[PDB]
Design a binder for this molecule. Structure first.
Ligand SMILES: [Mn+2]
Ligand SMILES: [Mn+2]
Ligand SMILES: [Mn+2]
Ligand SMILES: [Mn+2]
Ligand SMILES: [Mn+2]
Ligand SMILES: [Mn+2]
Ligand SMILES: [Mn+2]
Ligand SMILES: [Mn+2]
Lengths: 440, 440, 440, 440
């Protein structure tokens, strides 16, 4: 699936539509980042810049100029074609091909931005700029504005109003188009296959990073070159640590392994979590905790629909978790009272859902306590979980169990579509999947 | 193979040995780096900081204090243990375990560095600091020195001399110890196995990124989680681009594919390049260019030894290349006359060798035109190559051919040890290898 | 004459009147400035900050908050009263007295601005800030906005719109109130008396700086402690240099001395220039150049009235100068022809007038080529001049003559009021003033 | 008196003498400073830059290059001669005249410093730079060093050692040469005459700033254009405030007036304080406090000589003050016990002496608690004082009295020379001086 040229064009026009007449919006590309000495990390374009261009080069700036409600044009600043620096540092789009390729009216050399930007801003009333996003961008913008302010003798004037476009653009990204849903649907599929593969390849004795290897290879063969975030593979006590990326321990027979991994496909992120027994067979204790988490997820998947909210659904999940924990003796007391005092937090300390899109923890206003009413087009995760520390004062057989199950969904007119249901989560289906894989 | 505790201790003492009495050396860890929004790239420790600690955490500073020719001690600044935040930011070493684990005399919370550093520098004559390496480090150091300069009323004095320790430390890293050679040897084997696998899995129709996937999976299964640089897989015309990391094209029958990839094992880098026929059979034209590059490599591998230099060996390679190109009609004229003319540069535009170590393009002084005399312990690459542009005015059949063959060697008392010879490069051996793999 | 506390309140309300509802304007005080090592220059408050407060302390910020068309209040950030430390630095207003003294609703310690500013901006739609005016101010503002942007979980929101209030405030300062005119009138008198004294004290043999001394002493005895700009005293060839502040040469008999000096009274500037013979008697050549400049000034003083412009009057002065220069043989050719090619520029290279107010070169839009139509309330200078280089290719006697005559005027309903006519400029009156000065 | 060309040359060589071979010292001029909008404060050169050049222009850098123990040369970077920018911003030395005028071997345009500095530092082992002195200078130096570090392919190398030359240079400035003593002697005379004049002009009813005016006019007529620090004129209760520069109150009959003012002559500072009765007659109470301060000063003037220290002499003064205060009933108890508990601090809270030179609070190491042994050539002030708050719990008649008497001395072979004894301080002499001023 792909984001078409028509769509990129459409997004720009949707932004211009909200801009005041006599203004310009400046969107900067992300800077290259050093990994060590003279080597850089694989380039990752700025999500907002990507959203409007699908252009994967640094040192580029998109300038949308709105003259009035019926006239507007675009100018792109990007690296010049250097049939010398390209033979040495990869191909560049250049100014000649850019107009047709990216659908912009004009393209200029990034090396000329300081001599050209102020001329584009001269006389405008408003400039839309994400101040503070990038230092190199603020230098360029401030430099241009200063030049205009001090150039009255050259008949230059600077726009006195600067508006951060992030709130507007992020509200746009919060609602996915059909094209975006198709791409996210594919990212979910690819991510699901990777998780399925991890469960099938897992064997006691293997190291956590081995499953990471399986997952990344699967992402890659489907065209999703990079993960959308650092892969987590925590078996045993490591599963109780939410930010466990070391993936250095040997997986033991009898332990559970929690895997949170997602690919980045065409810029969009997949975000799946599956927890399963390293030896392919849930013990009674593990199965008891798992069922509570699964009930939470299945219930949430049933509840999420237009009209409700993350906060509301979270309330249902808290009740389910407290009830379950009381039944097992992990929590003692009256359910409603325990809920009233959030007695669940020691075991479920993170949110149930977060937006998903060009960023795994996507942009968009959540509302106080994530109470914003859900509408069709919003994409979010559903990731309930229970983590019982090795030293928690609870029945012995539950200590050291970390479980999380996470799916990605898109809100629809009548409810929601689960984009990652293609990888099993029911305990019996997991054990059957692993058994089938093991007889080879 | 790995680096022992004794070795990290040995390196610190080797640096202290060169420091003037009454001084302190400050070595900062690398900052965490943003990939997008709130997600970060997998952490990569600063090579120099790693060299002295093998500690993989950010917000850490190693302080080596030399009182006199016989008395010196160490202080480490690192993140505090937060048994209520490590659940969200992975496990941390902390101050209690650090002394024993890292072999430092004392450990303090990084959060206290501004209240403690100046006290450590107070009264010293010299401070060794890599000014300009990291902005956050310069802020900390300058802040401490300023506090001392302005604190005469508190009996504080700042060292007036600041020395950059990079030249000294890099000269140290230039000569590998037996332990380092063992680790680099393992990195070479792992990298070789990945390249072998790539040749065995290659089939027309597969995408360039597919081989990248095979390679990274192989690195990973051997414990080398990350590549030491971005993998290059350029088939057909892409092979003529040195910095080709897009790896997006479908590999066509009849084209060659150039693969430059290396793993990062225990911090050290492998760096291998192998070029081979996508269809497992070198055409005549491809084989003719290949032989010139292979001879260049094979000869260089015989020449490299103590007493010669990269510049000297490069001279031999230039002869070999010019001769070969003249015989094929790519170059026309007298050999010696063409050499004097560097008529080879349009086809071989990069260096023959570069140091190798904690960084793929390792630190260390090369001397003018890389004329420094080689000695035992130095580790370098040997990577001759020929790239004939698709539009080069040469015999038609050679256009669009990009070939490079690269091995990693360590200079020994009597010559050199090839660390990457475990992956074939002989054209017959390559074709035979691809044959034996395709029977399955 | 002074600025009443009622006027400061009036100015604030005039700014608030133009602000959008749900916004806040931030006006920062000027930073203290180092003269050398630990000594500072006498403090000079930021003109705009002064305009709204008349408060002469650094580390102070005026915050005007407009809730709606009828509700608005003010908050002042300023240094705290350090009863046990002011014994060292200086009496400070403090928070208790500020409200009644400065007429602000509330006052807070400047040391708490980072903990309070964001709370004041939280939830507003617009923030008026002079970005780029002061580094320390931008740090404070950006820090507060960043805190709001990243505090959605604390229900904090940052105003997305930032407007530079300078254009609005400067347009306000361009039109002087009756109170301001009274103060400027006094500044003009004081400055005039100083210039009169300089002419009366001048004698050959005295140094240029001696006249500077006379002038500053006169400013001071009338309560105008500091000059509004660096005093210029250029005799002989020094008069041909516009920015001559060395005032180091001995004044020779037969030379003219040009004096440009103005006091700063209650924040407002006087700006007068008078040129006269050091020996009290104009030489024929000097008198001939002087008359052209005087005619220019006299005609301009006659012309300036509502409806015309600096550009228009300048045109008249150019004709007068070209005509005069042709008659003396300094310029050769047809008057209109010479005018058309600006043949006057080598001798008159600066503007005829500039706004005057809290800054000698006051704020306010001039319009292209200073063509803005003049209206009552505008205060400007009238300073024609002619400078004939010592090596100018003109009749020998005129070489080395630098003359400028400048007065300060305020545009009125029927014309303009000359605020500095109390110091003579008619050549006869100057010579009479000087011979009579001696008579004692 | 003035500093000769030979002395500037001498100072440079004295610095070069202490530099290691193969190094360069960089000394930057002070930046111009904004007073308001586009107007600047009168330029004040950086004391250290001035010390080696006597050059009063900004955007200039002195580079002293030491090749070996016998070879060294100098390069000056300064503004270029611009016949236009000069007619507009004053005359400039330029490159042609600089060599001869400033006694430097070569001069280059400041506008070319970034293209030239690194070439001068290339290959050196040490660079002497006052890091942190000026931001613009650190930018230039860091930029040059970075260029060298990254230019190994161009055979460039950066000096790894950076030494702060301030400690060395300030130790030099601490010992005045004969020429400097002559200039400081003249500064003292000029300052003394100004103070004498202030006493003679003082009359009840006059404002504090009026005396300031008299003082500055006196400084000026002797060629000392600017004060070395902001003039203090505190009468009545204002005298109890050490940093009282408002000088805004009307001087009352019956009050004392404390005047601390000093001129800046040829870069050197005078620093005198005299306190006297506004009405020319000391009261019972005022005279009693005055005598204690005078005794302190006279005793210190006797004591100061080579071999003692500021700390030692301070001890004597403390005894004198405590004894005196006990006799008047301001302090109650045993002298020695009171001294042991510093019961004098509430009335004498500042130091007795500070170095004096190119800066009023001159550079140079004081030693712990200012215990450094005094030697011939050191110049310091002697300024004992007593300040009794208006609300101090002491005999009512002493409340609100602020008195300080300060002279400037130079340590000699046998004792010290008082540079400011030409202005009276004995109470009888003060009253007599003021009387001989109201002559009819
Ligand atoms: Mn996840
Ligand atoms: Mn998630
Ligand atoms: Mn390579
Ligand atoms: Mn290589
Ligand atoms: Mn003027
Ligand atoms: Mn003027
Ligand atoms: Mn003083
Ligand atoms: Mn003093």
């Amino acid at each position: 699936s792909e984001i078409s040229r028509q769509e990129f064009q459409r997004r720009r026009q949707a932004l211009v539509e909200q801009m005041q007449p006599g203004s310009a919006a400046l969107i900067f590309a992300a800077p290259e980042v050093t990994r060590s000495a003279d080597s850089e990390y694989p380039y990752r374009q700025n999500s907002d810049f990507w959203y409007f261009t699908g252009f994967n080069e640094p040192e580029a700036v998109l300038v949308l100029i709105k003259s009035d409600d019926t006239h507007n044009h675009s100018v792109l600043f990007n690296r010049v074609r250097d049939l010398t620096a390209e033979i040495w540092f990869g191909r560049r789009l250049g100014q000649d091909a850019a107009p047709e390729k990216l659908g912009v009216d004009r393209a200029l050399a990034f090396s000329e931005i300081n001599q050209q930007l102020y001329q584009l801003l001269n006389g405008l009333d408003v400039v839309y700029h994400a101040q503070g996003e990038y230092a190199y961008a603020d230098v360029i913008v401030n430099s241009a504005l200063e030049k205009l302010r001090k150039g009255s003798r050259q008949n230059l004037t600077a726009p006195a109003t600067m508006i951060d476009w992030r709130p507007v653009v992020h509200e746009m990204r919060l609602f996915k188009s059909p094209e975006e849903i198709a791409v996210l649907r594919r990212a979910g599929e690819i991510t699901a296959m990777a998780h399925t593969r991890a469960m099938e390849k897992c064997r006691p004795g293997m190291f956590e990073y081995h499953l990471e290897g399986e997952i990344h290879h699967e992402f890659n063969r489907h065209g999703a070159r990079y993960p959308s975030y650092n892969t987590i593979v925590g078996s045993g006590e490591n599963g109780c640590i939410l930010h466990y990326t070391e993936n250095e321990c040997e997986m033991r027979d009898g332990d559970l392994v929690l895997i949170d991994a997602g690919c980045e496909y065409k810029g969009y992120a997949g975000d799946i979590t599956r927890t399963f027994p390293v030896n392919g067979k849930f013990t009674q204790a593990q199965r008891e905790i798992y069922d509570i988490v699964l009930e939470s997820l299945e219930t949430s998947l049933r509840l999420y629909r237009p009209g409700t909210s993350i906060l509301e659904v979270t309330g249902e999940v808290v009740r389910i978790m407290v009830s379950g924990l009381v039944k097992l003796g992990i929590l003692k007391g009256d359910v409603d009272e325990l809920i009233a005092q959030n007695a669940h937090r020691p075991f479920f300390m993170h949110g149930l859902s977060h937006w998903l899109g060009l960023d795994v923890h996507d942009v968009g206003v959540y509302g106080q306590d994530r109470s914003r009413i859900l509408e069709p087009g919003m994409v979010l995760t559903v990731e309930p979980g229970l983590y019982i520390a090795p030293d928690a004062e609870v029945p012995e057989q539950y200590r050291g169990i970390g479980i999380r199950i996470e799916d990605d969904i898109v809100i629809t007119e009548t409810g929601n579509e689960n984009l990652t249901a293609s990888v099993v989560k029911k305990p019996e289906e997991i054990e059957a999947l692993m058994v089938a894989a093991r007889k080879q």
